[PDB]
Amino acid sequence: VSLDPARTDRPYLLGRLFAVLEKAQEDAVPGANATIKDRYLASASANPGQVFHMLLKNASNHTAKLRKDPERKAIHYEIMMQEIIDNISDFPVTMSSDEQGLFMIGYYHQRKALFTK
Amino acid sequence: MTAIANRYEFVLLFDVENGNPNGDPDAGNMPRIDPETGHGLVTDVCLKRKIRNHVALTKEGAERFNIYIQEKAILNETHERAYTACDLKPEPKKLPKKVEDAKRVTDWMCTNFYDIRTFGAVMTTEVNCGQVRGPVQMAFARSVEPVVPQEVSITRMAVTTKAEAEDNRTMGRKHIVPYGLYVAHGFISAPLAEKTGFSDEDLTLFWDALVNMFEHDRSAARGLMSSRKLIVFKHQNRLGNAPAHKLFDLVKVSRAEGSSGPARSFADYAVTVGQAPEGVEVKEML
Amino acid sequence: MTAIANRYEFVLLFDVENGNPNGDPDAGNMPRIDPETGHGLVTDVCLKRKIRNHVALTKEGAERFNIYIQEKAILNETHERAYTACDLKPEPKKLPKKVEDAKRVTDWMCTNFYDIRTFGAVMTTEVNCGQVRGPVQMAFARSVEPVVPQEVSITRMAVTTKAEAEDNRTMGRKHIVPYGLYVAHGFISAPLAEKTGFSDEDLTLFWDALVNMFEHDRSAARGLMSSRKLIVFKHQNRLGNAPAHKLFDLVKVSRAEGSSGPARSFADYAVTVGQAPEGVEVKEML
Amino acid sequence: LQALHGYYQRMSADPDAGMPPYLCGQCLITGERQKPIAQLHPSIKGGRDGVRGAQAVASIVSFNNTAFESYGKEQSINAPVSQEAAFSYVTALNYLLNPSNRQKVTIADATVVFWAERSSPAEDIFAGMFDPPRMHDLLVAIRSGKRATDIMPDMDESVRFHVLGLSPNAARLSVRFWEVDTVGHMLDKVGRHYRELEIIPQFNNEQEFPSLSTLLRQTAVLNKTENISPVLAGGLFRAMLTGGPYPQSLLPAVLGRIRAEHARPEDKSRYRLEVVTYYRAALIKAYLIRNRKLEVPVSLDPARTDRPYLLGRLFAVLEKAQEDAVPGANATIKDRYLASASANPGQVFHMLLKNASNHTAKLRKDPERKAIHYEIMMQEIIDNISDFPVTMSSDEQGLFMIGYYHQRKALFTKK
């Protein structure tokens, strides 16, 4: 995958975070209506500082749900969450139209990487 | 019929609780928001709809107070009715080639229909009676603070269709806003009013509609909504005595002392109004 | 009507909020933009039309205060009237020559019609009446910052034409600018005025028109628009004393240091005016 | 102009196309000395029949006004030629312009005529083959690359061939281009011209050997036969038969059209007309070859791996979503964003993507859930990219349209 695991660009990081969150959720609850993407893509971009902290609540709940089962992937995700977030000093208030584009890129690269076996 | 003789400006305030004020028909059905800032938005069309509803409810077909049967009607029929009512042969694409009767196929409308008299309409349609501009205009509504839409899940007893796959049989969604406070602006023009006859009694009825708009609107999804404030500026001559933007600046909204993080009631806010120039009259008690 | 005796230049600033300042006839009806930079654009033509409207409104057709480029008019009839009022009848469509009394038909049109007196007109059409330049000019308006036009999806609960083919709602859409600030330039020249009689009273009228033109322009699609600044440079003799571009450089616009994120109000910007050379004097209208 | 005089001499001895009717100085056209000099020349046919758009009576040489006279000499004395030479000269021309004989064609501003130095079938072939309505076996022969003699050995490739293009203004006449090449060389260059133009057709009914008059129209404001820039009509015709570069002005012209276009329900076509037509794509491809020396394929290339070409592909796919989402669509992103996205990608693509989500989402809730197939493709494309460029130069803005046309076709092939 074209994913660069050492970019360290804040919007890129954010997009990767988003993707991982989505994947986690997906694993947690088979047969769901839709994705996280569908519900909160817009908002995230609009106002990163207001939504991420809510997303991380649900993340935990999902992980909890998962881990109890033999499918203890979900520990592997949590480590990634650790790593990603580690590099971030604070959440942005607003994002330019430009870094919005960047944001997207990061998302996609990470998405494909997760789907790899 | 005697038109008004002064220019007007006004400001309106309202809020919501655990409701969807106006659903976006493209974004699933989520509330409308500012993509850049997260501020909420409300279309003026919505408001006008509400006002028309209230007028129809309260007057109930009184003369000169018809509402253009806006619900599910074939609009072009009323135009040929104006033509035939004016004794003019209906013209699909064009107005009559006769100034007086040409305008009459519209003046009949103005006499009959209140909402046409107030907002105007496009009437160059497949039956042509012309155009109207409307003496009353409004802009978009904007929240004073960012909003955070929420979504919830629903079960179901039963199945609509032949779902033979064969508990809790179905999911469903709802979209809500915990809290929010909104503002709006509006204008009234006398020179245009002279062209349609929008008169004082109509203005009073309009004020009443604004005060009591929400009371008859209860629905499942609507939640709880109400109006809070209303300030009216009245110039002293047919053309105003000050710019509009200066007037709207006299009203200011801010957090109460007890900020306490998330806002959840009207009580959280403080509202104040300045003092107007000499040529403008301020009445706010409405 | 004596001509003015000095050269003039000026700069104008104005806002927009949740509106479409000028629709593009090719791009569906999106706002006009610079495809390469994202900056917004406004045609001078629009401004001119606004001015004409305002004048018309205010003056109400007083002598020497008519306007010529008027709603659905057939223009060559006014040329034939000018010819006839000068006791004469026109040449055929070729008209490579001047008209049979160039002075009197041109002066007849100059006298009576204000906007001709101001702007000029191409008028060597099939009824010849000559040709005019006009002393007052202005260029395009460009936004200080790139803009982000956005589209809005809306409904109607009624249909126009009986061919329902199904009684149902109808979809539509809108286009808006969240916010934007514009700048424009203009010039006035004495020698041209000498040829037309453009007089100081006209100039005062002109200033007033500029200050207030927007106030009478409210409509559905417009939103809220208003003028904010106006600076006028006056030279001390019949011909200037400094290049134009030098003067326009004295006005500087920049965002207030405290603001961040996308701009949303005139308070987000700071405006500064310098000191003019000795041969010019600076005055601020608004 | 020796050509005309020699032409008349050639066949005037023959029983058709030539008739016998008709101080002292040096006759320029013939170079002979001490012959009577004509004071004025016979007229040239105008009108539709003659030179289209001209005055009823037209001339090549005229000195009406003082500003046109030099060294104190008056009227036709400014250019001495014998009476017989002028007669024959004019006569030949007049004959040629006769529509009754297959030697004339009209292109935008101008009327064009041609002849062979000697009697040959070439005259016949060229009239149709340069602007199509044996027919096309010799066309695939020159497009392939083989010589003309292969298909028709009889053709003396050594024979000379003439071409002349004229356009009028009032009663006076002008010259836009003139060419004198030989047979062999001439259609060799025409073969080359066809190779470059080659593109996969979008619909089965479309031309395969597009007519030059067809192509020019496509640049018109409203697809009208008028409104064609007389300068591009002259430039392309000369570039075709000389084999030189296309005029630099051509490319931004095309891009302008694509910017200015919007669908025309008023024309009541069943399909909402495509902005990047079959024809427009062809013109763009050809320009990148001669002028820019690029490589570009005839069909979709899944391995191309270039940011401008990739981004063109991307725009195609995400459009498809829209179409499916809303059958019988009102307007499409093609009608509004295509100019912006191709010039200034980093300012628009962000939001474009966001929108696409909703389309996908709605396609995912309904049956026929292959939003999925589109979703994969996006991912694939994306991976190859690092960053969105802020601005693209014109050369970058051709490739984007080619990537779009190829990718859109690729999807039509499915449906």
From TrEMBL, chains B, C:
Q: Which InterPro entries match?
A: Cas7_Csh2/Csh2 (IPR006482), CRISPR-assoc_prot_Cas7/Csd2 (IPR013418)
| Keywords in alphabetical order | Plasmid
A single Pfam family it belongs to is Cas_Cas7
CDD domains per UniProt: Cas7_I-C
Q: Which residues form a coiled coil?
A: none
Q: Name one GO biological process term.
A: maintenance of CRISPR repeat elements
Q: What is this protein called?
A: CRISPR-associated protein, TM1801 family
Q: Which organism does this record belong to?
A: Nitratidesulfovibrio vulgaris (strain ATCC 29579 / DSM 644 / CCUG 34227 / NCIMB 8303 / VKM B-1760 / Hildenborough)
Automatic annotation (TrEMBL), chain D:
Q: Which UniProt keywords apply?
A: Plasmid
Whether Zinc counts among this entry's keywords is no
Please give the superkingdom of this protein's source.
Bacteria
InterPro entries recorded: CRISPR-assoc_prot_Csd1-typ
| UniProt-recorded name of the protein | CRISPR-associated protein, CT1133 family
Q: Which organism is it from?
A: Nitratidesulfovibrio vulgaris (strain ATCC 29579 / DSM 644 / CCUG 34227 / NCIMB 8303 / VKM B-1760 / Hildenborough)
